[PDB]
Amino acid sequence: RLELPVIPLRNTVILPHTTTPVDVGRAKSKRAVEEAMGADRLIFLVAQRDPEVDDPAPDDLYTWGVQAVVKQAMRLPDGTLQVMVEARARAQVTDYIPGPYLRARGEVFSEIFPIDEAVVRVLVEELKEAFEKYVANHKSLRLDRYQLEAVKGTSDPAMLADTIAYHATWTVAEKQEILELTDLEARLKKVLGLLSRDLERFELDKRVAQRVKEQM
Amino acid sequence: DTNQREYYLREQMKAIQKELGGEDGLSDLEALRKKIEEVGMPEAVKTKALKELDRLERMQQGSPEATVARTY
Amino acid sequence: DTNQREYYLREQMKAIQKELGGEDGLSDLEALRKKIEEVGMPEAVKTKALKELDRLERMQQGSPEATVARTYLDWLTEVPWSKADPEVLDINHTRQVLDEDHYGLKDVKERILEYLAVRQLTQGLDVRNKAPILVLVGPPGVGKTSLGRSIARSMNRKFHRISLGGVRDEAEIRGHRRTYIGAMPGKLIHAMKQVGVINPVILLDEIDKMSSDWRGDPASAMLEVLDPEQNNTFTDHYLDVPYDLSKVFFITTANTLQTIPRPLLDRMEVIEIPGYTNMEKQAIARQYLWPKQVRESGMEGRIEVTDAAILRVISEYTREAGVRGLERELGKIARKGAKFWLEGAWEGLRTIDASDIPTY
Amino acid sequence: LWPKQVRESGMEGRIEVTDAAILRVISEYTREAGVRGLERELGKIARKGAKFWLEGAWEGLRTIDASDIPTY
Amino acid sequence: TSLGRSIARSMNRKFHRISLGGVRDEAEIRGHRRTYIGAMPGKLIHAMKQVGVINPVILLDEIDKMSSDWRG
Amino acid sequence: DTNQREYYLREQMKAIQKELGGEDGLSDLEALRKKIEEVGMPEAVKTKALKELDRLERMQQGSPEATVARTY
Amino acid sequence: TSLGRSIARSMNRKFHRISLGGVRDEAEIRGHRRTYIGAMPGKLIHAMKQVGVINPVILLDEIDKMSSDWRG
Ligand SMILES: Nc1ncnc2c1ncn2[C@@H]1O[C@H](COP(=O)(O)OP(=O)(O)O)[C@@H](O)[C@H]1O
């Protein structure tokens, strides 16, 4: 929501509808965690950039803030407050109000359900099959099975799309491009294209590995 | 372990082979062999070309005679 | 998909070649690959660079397949592609340029005026001449190269020079098949790499002072690299996919019309440039030769030479038709003035005159 | 021969040669047994006509009689 | 040469020519046995190479402008 | 079995020829590393020398890489 | 040579001479292709290596006793 505390995300943006733990190590983010504890377990998560600055900055954040309902908040004395957050959907960030701790106001979720939902469900099924093939073949590339088990039995197509997008490994710019796409089918098509690219790379890896063992 | 890794990475480098980029080439002197096959030539030409293709593939580096053979 | 898989191949090789056995290549094949498939040059470069991908990934020391690979890549991606400086197309501009830079015979100017008048009327929905190439015949001293420089300035093009009196085999003007380091593309690709745009004015020096000492007469290669309807789709042995020499200007020079090759005598318009007269040489000295010596040797406001001394030097110290001997005489005058100034100048502006020229 | 010259030198429909001038060129400007000399003379005529037309086009269609040949 | 071009056009095969005049040795027609970099065959092989068809119409230029003193 | 044992033993021979200290297999190798650095060369020369430096870490009876690398 | 040495003294530089009598190969003048051990660089390169200065005075003696032949 608006003027909600902001916790910079660690090393990548946490996509919505995914069961992920988020590390909180810096005290500047700890203060925002404490203030978010006063906002009824609701955090307007705005992520910072690639390799991070030790302190949150009013210019290194992203333009999409995801609103998350915290399942549980467990505390550790090692120095990191690992929070278990299950998000809802993305939302745009108007501007940046400096801190620390940082603040940022947003709006309602940008995920929308357009017309022609038959194509939506067809693309959801196609992407689910493509990701099942992608994960199943990627055992030599170390793709977990709990990630494949966490995408079955979903109601919202956005839930399935974001959950699969998180479980597939690529850079952060493509994740930002996916989160920018508010269309329910554009995100699915982008995930399908990225999975196709990664699967072509996987096929190249298999072919070159076969060549290596043949040479052996 | 260093020697094993070096052999493994040499094998991986040979595997790259360039794939779609390597479709013409195939480790070099292969496209040339196929083009020998592709061009309909007198059988004596075919035999001489195969003989000097066998004379090729002999570490062009440090041997410019392989270069003149490729020119032929 | 092809481009991204080749990008992955680039990433793996640039991660691996750090420990590669051959370091003569410098493991820069991937660093230099930023102009293979991140290229701002046309499809020919892309196709060869795809073929150049095969030539990579080997060792060094004696006839490398990788040093030649990166050398060919650099040659392909450093010769300008589709980049032309904005040329001004005027003949009146040349009318002023051939007056602001030379005393001139006023006879050789008009021949270049004719040729440029042709060059404005480039028709056929393209630019193609099928016409001669400004062969200039005369002594060395006479301002052939300066005429070329003035023409290039008039049309705003980068002038060049590549001697052809030092070529004896069809390999310093041609190439060699790219398979090993130690082979160099011809002098014309050298000149094309020297410039950064696709339309440079190029000069050719002492074509008539070229012979076939070794096996192979460079005349045929000259005719092939120059004929402005077959060279628009031309490469020598070193390069593979054609590079056009149609937009590229070609002015030429020689000393006699007898040893110019007979096949090259096609599309030649002889522009005869004779010597000069003593008054003309005196004006040349007092305008562009003696001032040249003055600010070359460091004589800003130091010494001035009376016209009598200039004409005496011309009539005494040089008889060659060119303005090279007079230039050298005035340069040695500048040297002796540099001394006779370095032991103290009697005034801010010393005076040179015909009385003591043999002293200088 | 002449039409090719004019079509190359960018002067079609903007210069003409009263073929008496062609006779003059043949009888005065070339003594060789072929046409290469004639084609060089007509090339010079084309280029000089282009130059003269480039100092200001005085007409929509030019003409060259036999008299003014030692001016073009 | 223009007659040869007309003949080739009538036969509808790509014309070509090679300035065989000024060739002072047998080596420029037969080449030499390849034993170094820069091993080059004769003029006729060049002509057939740049004409990518096996049935061209080659014009032996200036066939009466040769000399024979050395190298065959 | 014998070849594996021989490779093992020769490799401890390589691993004990490091002059005991293990700073370098040969003194000449570590001398060139600092001599390149201790001389102020342009970015075109120093940067390349830092990459042909990797041809070192070889010894006479092993790879002949250092045989000409040290001379260069 | 003694005038050269005196100029070097006056200029406060390092005199050095490399003889050029009877030289025909670029390998004699400058470096030859990097064939491993053997085929050492040429005369002037060795002269530049001898002096420890980057601005020396080099006396190219009997420079008119050279020769131009094959191999560079
Ligand atoms: N009208 C002119 N005639 C002759 N020389 C001139 C004229 N105007 C200037 N020069 C000078 O004369 C010199 C001729 O030398 P150069 O160009 O080296 O001759 P080349 O290059 O043809 O051997 C030029 O440096 C030029 O500056």
PDB file of N, CA and C in Angstrom, chain G residues 9-66:
ATOM      1  N   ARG G   9      78.724  11.956 -27.075  1.00  0.00           N
ATOM      2  CA  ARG G   9      79.216  12.615 -25.867  1.00  0.00           C
ATOM      3  C   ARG G   9      78.600  13.999 -25.705  1.00  0.00           C
ATOM      4  N   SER G  10      78.617  14.802 -26.771  1.00  0.00           N
ATOM      5  CA  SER G  10      78.063  16.150 -26.696  1.00  0.00           C
ATOM      6  C   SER G  10      76.566  16.116 -26.420  1.00  0.00           C
ATOM      7  N   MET G  11      75.852  15.203 -27.069  1.00  0.00           N
ATOM      8  CA  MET G  11      74.422  15.031 -26.864  1.00  0.00           C
ATOM      9  C   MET G  11      74.098  14.284 -25.578  1.00  0.00           C
ATOM     10  N   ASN G  12      75.108  13.713 -24.916  1.00  0.00           N
ATOM     11  CA  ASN G  12      74.934  12.980 -23.660  1.00  0.00           C
ATOM     12  C   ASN G  12      73.964  11.812 -23.832  1.00  0.00           C
ATOM     13  N   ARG G  13      74.250  10.973 -24.819  1.00  0.00           N
ATOM     14  CA  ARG G  13      73.470   9.783 -25.127  1.00  0.00           C
ATOM     15  C   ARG G  13      74.422   8.589 -25.224  1.00  0.00           C
ATOM     16  N   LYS G  14      73.883   7.436 -25.610  1.00  0.00           N
ATOM     17  CA  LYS G  14      74.657   6.200 -25.700  1.00  0.00           C
ATOM     18  C   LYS G  14      74.896   5.870 -27.168  1.00  0.00           C
ATOM     19  N   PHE G  15      76.147   5.989 -27.602  1.00  0.00           N
ATOM     20  CA  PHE G  15      76.514   5.587 -28.950  1.00  0.00           C
ATOM     21  C   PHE G  15      76.419   4.072 -29.092  1.00  0.00           C
ATOM     22  N   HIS G  16      76.039   3.630 -30.288  1.00  0.00           N
ATOM     23  CA  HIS G  16      75.973   2.209 -30.599  1.00  0.00           C
ATOM     24  C   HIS G  16      75.888   2.050 -32.107  1.00  0.00           C
ATOM     25  N   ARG G  17      76.615   1.072 -32.638  1.00  0.00           N
ATOM     26  CA  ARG G  17      76.656   0.827 -34.071  1.00  0.00           C
ATOM     27  C   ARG G  17      76.240  -0.605 -34.370  1.00  0.00           C
ATOM     28  N   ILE G  18      75.518  -0.777 -35.474  1.00  0.00           N
ATOM     29  CA  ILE G  18      75.175  -2.090 -36.007  1.00  0.00           C
ATOM     30  C   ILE G  18      75.584  -2.118 -37.475  1.00  0.00           C
ATOM     31  N   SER G  19      76.448  -3.063 -37.830  1.00  0.00           N
ATOM     32  CA  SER G  19      76.970  -3.125 -39.188  1.00  0.00           C
ATOM     33  C   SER G  19      75.894  -3.612 -40.148  1.00  0.00           C
ATOM     34  N   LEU G  20      75.848  -3.012 -41.337  1.00  0.00           N
ATOM     35  CA  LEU G  20      74.895  -3.395 -42.370  1.00  0.00           C
ATOM     36  C   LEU G  20      75.588  -3.749 -43.683  1.00  0.00           C
ATOM     37  N   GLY G  21      76.745  -4.400 -43.601  1.00  0.00           N
ATOM     38  CA  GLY G  21      77.446  -4.839 -44.790  1.00  0.00           C
ATOM     39  C   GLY G  21      77.124  -6.274 -45.148  1.00  0.00           C
ATOM     40  N   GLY G  22      76.477  -6.477 -46.292  1.00  0.00           N
ATOM     41  CA  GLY G  22      76.093  -7.810 -46.711  1.00  0.00           C
ATOM     42  C   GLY G  22      74.862  -8.328 -45.994  1.00  0.00           C
ATOM     43  N   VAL G  23      73.744  -7.623 -46.149  1.00  0.00           N
ATOM     44  CA  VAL G  23      72.472  -8.002 -45.547  1.00  0.00           C
ATOM     45  C   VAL G  23      71.437  -8.100 -46.658  1.00  0.00           C
ATOM     46  N   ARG G  24      70.680  -9.197 -46.672  1.00  0.00           N
ATOM     47  CA  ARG G  24      69.736  -9.447 -47.755  1.00  0.00           C
ATOM     48  C   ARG G  24      68.346  -9.805 -47.242  1.00  0.00           C
ATOM     49  N   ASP G  25      68.256 -10.298 -46.012  1.00  0.00           N
ATOM     50  CA  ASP G  25      67.002 -10.780 -45.451  1.00  0.00           C
ATOM     51  C   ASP G  25      66.463  -9.805 -44.416  1.00  0.00           C
ATOM     52  N   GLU G  26      65.134  -9.663 -44.384  1.00  0.00           N
ATOM     53  CA  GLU G  26      64.501  -8.941 -43.287  1.00  0.00           C
ATOM     54  C   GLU G  26      64.750  -9.635 -41.958  1.00  0.00           C
ATOM     55  N   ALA G  27      64.858 -10.967 -41.970  1.00  0.00           N
ATOM     56  CA  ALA G  27      65.222 -11.694 -40.760  1.00  0.00           C
ATOM     57  C   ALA G  27      66.585 -11.261 -40.241  1.00  0.00           C
ATOM     58  N   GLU G  28      67.487 -10.860 -41.137  1.00  0.00           N
ATOM     59  CA  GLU G  28      68.757 -10.288 -40.711  1.00  0.00           C
ATOM     60  C   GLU G  28      68.572  -8.883 -40.151  1.00  0.00           C
ATOM     61  N   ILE G  29      67.668  -8.100 -40.738  1.00  0.00           N
ATOM     62  CA  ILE G  29      67.422  -6.742 -40.257  1.00  0.00           C
ATOM     63  C   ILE G  29      66.547  -6.763 -39.011  1.00  0.00           C
ATOM     64  N   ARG G  30      65.333  -7.288 -39.135  1.00  0.00           N
ATOM     65  CA  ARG G  30      64.391  -7.348 -38.028  1.00  0.00           C
ATOM     66  C   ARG G  30      64.043  -8.807 -37.734  1.00  0.00           C
ATOM     67  N   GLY G  31      63.049  -9.002 -36.873  1.00  0.00           N
ATOM     68  CA  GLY G  31      62.711 -10.340 -36.432  1.00  0.00           C
ATOM     69  C   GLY G  31      62.170 -11.209 -37.552  1.00  0.00           C
ATOM     70  N   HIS G  32      62.352 -12.515 -37.385  1.00  0.00           N
ATOM     71  CA  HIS G  32      61.745 -13.537 -38.223  1.00  0.00           C
ATOM     72  C   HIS G  32      60.566 -14.154 -37.478  1.00  0.00           C
ATOM     73  N   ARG G  33      59.653 -14.767 -38.237  1.00  0.00           N
ATOM     74  CA  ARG G  33      58.450 -15.349 -37.650  1.00  0.00           C
ATOM     75  C   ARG G  33      58.803 -16.245 -36.469  1.00  0.00           C
ATOM     76  N   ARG G  34      57.946 -16.223 -35.447  1.00  0.00           N
ATOM     77  CA  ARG G  34      58.274 -16.824 -34.153  1.00  0.00           C
ATOM     78  C   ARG G  34      58.233 -18.344 -34.258  1.00  0.00           C
ATOM     79  N   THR G  35      59.213 -18.888 -34.970  1.00  0.00           N
ATOM     80  CA  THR G  35      59.547 -20.296 -34.840  1.00  0.00           C
ATOM     81  C   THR G  35      60.272 -20.488 -33.515  1.00  0.00           C
ATOM     82  N   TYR G  36      59.904 -21.532 -32.775  1.00  0.00           N
ATOM     83  CA  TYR G  36      60.537 -21.761 -31.485  1.00  0.00           C
ATOM     84  C   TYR G  36      62.020 -22.086 -31.681  1.00  0.00           C
ATOM     85  N   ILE G  37      62.709 -22.329 -30.561  1.00  0.00           N
ATOM     86  CA  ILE G  37      64.111 -21.951 -30.369  1.00  0.00           C
ATOM     87  C   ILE G  37      64.943 -22.143 -31.633  1.00  0.00           C
ATOM     88  N   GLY G  38      65.635 -21.079 -32.034  1.00  0.00           N
ATOM     89  CA  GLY G  38      66.153 -20.946 -33.381  1.00  0.00           C
ATOM     90  C   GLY G  38      65.467 -19.791 -34.086  1.00  0.00           C
ATOM     91  N   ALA G  39      66.053 -19.304 -35.181  1.00  0.00           N
ATOM     92  CA  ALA G  39      65.517 -18.169 -35.938  1.00  0.00           C
ATOM     93  C   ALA G  39      65.393 -16.929 -35.049  1.00  0.00           C
ATOM     94  N   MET G  40      66.549 -16.464 -34.580  1.00  0.00           N
ATOM     95  CA  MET G  40      66.624 -15.351 -33.649  1.00  0.00           C
ATOM     96  C   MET G  40      66.336 -14.042 -34.391  1.00  0.00           C
ATOM     97  N   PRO G  41      65.814 -13.029 -33.695  1.00  0.00           N
ATOM     98  CA  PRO G  41      65.598 -11.720 -34.331  1.00  0.00           C
ATOM     99  C   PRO G  41      66.869 -11.137 -34.936  1.00  0.00           C
ATOM    100  N   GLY G  42      66.678 -10.046 -35.675  1.00  0.00           N
ATOM    101  CA  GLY G  42      67.684  -9.521 -36.575  1.00  0.00           C
ATOM    102  C   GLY G  42      68.656  -8.538 -35.954  1.00  0.00           C
ATOM    103  N   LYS G  43      69.313  -7.776 -36.832  1.00  0.00           N
ATOM    104  CA  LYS G  43      70.442  -6.942 -36.427  1.00  0.00           C
ATOM    105  C   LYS G  43      69.991  -5.747 -35.596  1.00  0.00           C
ATOM    106  N   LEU G  44      69.139  -4.893 -36.169  1.00  0.00           N
ATOM    107  CA  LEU G  44      68.776  -3.650 -35.496  1.00  0.00           C
ATOM    108  C   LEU G  44      67.999  -3.910 -34.214  1.00  0.00           C
ATOM    109  N   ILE G  45      67.233  -5.000 -34.163  1.00  0.00           N
ATOM    110  CA  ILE G  45      66.530  -5.346 -32.933  1.00  0.00           C
ATOM    111  C   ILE G  45      67.527  -5.700 -31.835  1.00  0.00           C
ATOM    112  N   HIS G  46      68.560  -6.470 -32.179  1.00  0.00           N
ATOM    113  CA  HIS G  46      69.614  -6.769 -31.214  1.00  0.00           C
ATOM    114  C   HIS G  46      70.338  -5.502 -30.783  1.00  0.00           C
ATOM    115  N   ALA G  47      70.567  -4.581 -31.723  1.00  0.00           N
ATOM    116  CA  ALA G  47      71.201  -3.311 -31.379  1.00  0.00           C
ATOM    117  C   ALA G  47      70.351  -2.519 -30.394  1.00  0.00           C
ATOM    118  N   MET G  48      69.036  -2.486 -30.616  1.00  0.00           N
ATOM    119  CA  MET G  48      68.138  -1.806 -29.690  1.00  0.00           C
ATOM    120  C   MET G  48      68.102  -2.498 -28.334  1.00  0.00           C
ATOM    121  N   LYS G  49      68.250  -3.824 -28.315  1.00  0.00           N
ATOM    122  CA  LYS G  49      68.264  -4.548 -27.048  1.00  0.00           C
ATOM    123  C   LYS G  49      69.558  -4.316 -26.275  1.00  0.00           C
ATOM    124  N   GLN G  50      70.676  -4.130 -26.979  1.00  0.00           N
ATOM    125  CA  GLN G  50      71.965  -3.986 -26.305  1.00  0.00           C
ATOM    126  C   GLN G  50      71.985  -2.757 -25.406  1.00  0.00           C
ATOM    127  N   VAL G  51      71.597  -1.601 -25.944  1.00  0.00           N
ATOM    128  CA  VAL G  51      71.585  -0.382 -25.148  1.00  0.00           C
ATOM    129  C   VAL G  51      70.444  -0.434 -24.139  1.00  0.00           C
ATOM    130  N   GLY G  52      70.661   0.195 -22.988  1.00  0.00           N
ATOM    131  CA  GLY G  52      69.643   0.267 -21.960  1.00  0.00           C
ATOM    132  C   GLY G  52      68.884   1.575 -21.996  1.00  0.00           C
ATOM    133  N   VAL G  53      68.948   2.268 -23.131  1.00  0.00           N
ATOM    134  CA  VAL G  53      68.324   3.574 -23.289  1.00  0.00           C
ATOM    135  C   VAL G  53      67.338   3.519 -24.446  1.00  0.00           C
ATOM    136  N   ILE G  54      66.226   4.243 -24.289  1.00  0.00           N
ATOM    137  CA  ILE G  54      65.192   4.299 -25.316  1.00  0.00           C
ATOM    138  C   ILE G  54      65.424   5.422 -26.311  1.00  0.00           C
ATOM    139  N   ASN G  55      66.443   6.252 -26.103  1.00  0.00           N
ATOM    140  CA  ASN G  55      66.803   7.322 -27.033  1.00  0.00           C
ATOM    141  C   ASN G  55      68.303   7.275 -27.309  1.00  0.00           C
ATOM    142  N   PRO G  56      68.773   6.244 -28.002  1.00  0.00           N
ATOM    143  CA  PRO G  56      70.203   6.123 -28.281  1.00  0.00           C
ATOM    144  C   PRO G  56      70.579   6.776 -29.607  1.00  0.00           C
ATOM    145  N   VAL G  57      71.881   6.807 -29.860  1.00  0.00           N
ATOM    146  CA  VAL G  57      72.430   7.260 -31.131  1.00  0.00           C
ATOM    147  C   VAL G  57      72.959   6.037 -31.864  1.00  0.00           C
ATOM    148  N   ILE G  58      72.368   5.731 -33.015  1.00  0.00           N
ATOM    149  CA  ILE G  58      72.679   4.522 -33.767  1.00  0.00           C
ATOM    150  C   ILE G  58      73.408   4.924 -35.040  1.00  0.00           C
ATOM    151  N   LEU G  59      74.610   4.385 -35.227  1.00  0.00           N
ATOM    152  CA  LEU G  59      75.417   4.639 -36.414  1.00  0.00           C
ATOM    153  C   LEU G  59      75.302   3.432 -37.340  1.00  0.00           C
ATOM    154  N   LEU G  60      74.497   3.566 -38.390  1.00  0.00           N
ATOM    155  CA  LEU G  60      74.327   2.510 -39.384  1.00  0.00           C
ATOM    156  C   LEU G  60      75.484   2.594 -40.373  1.00  0.00           C
ATOM    157  N   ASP G  61      76.563   1.878 -40.083  1.00  0.00           N
ATOM    158  CA  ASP G  61      77.775   1.939 -40.886  1.00  0.00           C
ATOM    159  C   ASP G  61      77.601   1.179 -42.196  1.00  0.00           C
ATOM    160  N   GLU G  62      78.360   1.608 -43.205  1.00  0.00           N
ATOM    161  CA  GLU G  62      78.350   1.036 -44.558  1.00  0.00           C
ATOM    162  C   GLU G  62      76.933   0.678 -45.017  1.00  0.00           C
ATOM    163  N   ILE G  63      76.007   1.611 -44.776  1.00  0.00           N
ATOM    164  CA  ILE G  63      74.609   1.409 -45.140  1.00  0.00           C
ATOM    165  C   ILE G  63      74.442   1.187 -46.637  1.00  0.00           C
ATOM    166  N   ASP G  64      75.407   1.623 -47.444  1.00  0.00           N
ATOM    167  CA  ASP G  64      75.383   1.401 -48.882  1.00  0.00           C
ATOM    168  C   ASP G  64      76.002   0.067 -49.297  1.00  0.00           C
ATOM    169  N   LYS G  65      76.170  -0.861 -48.361  1.00  0.00           N
ATOM    170  CA  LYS G  65      76.682  -2.196 -48.639  1.00  0.00           C
ATOM    171  C   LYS G  65      75.607  -3.241 -48.369  1.00  0.00           C
ATOM    172  N   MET G  66      74.374  -2.930 -48.759  1.00  0.00           N
ATOM    173  CA  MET G  66      73.237  -3.802 -48.534  1.00  0.00           C
ATOM    174  C   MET G  66      72.910  -4.579 -49.807  1.00  0.00           C
TER     175      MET G  66
END
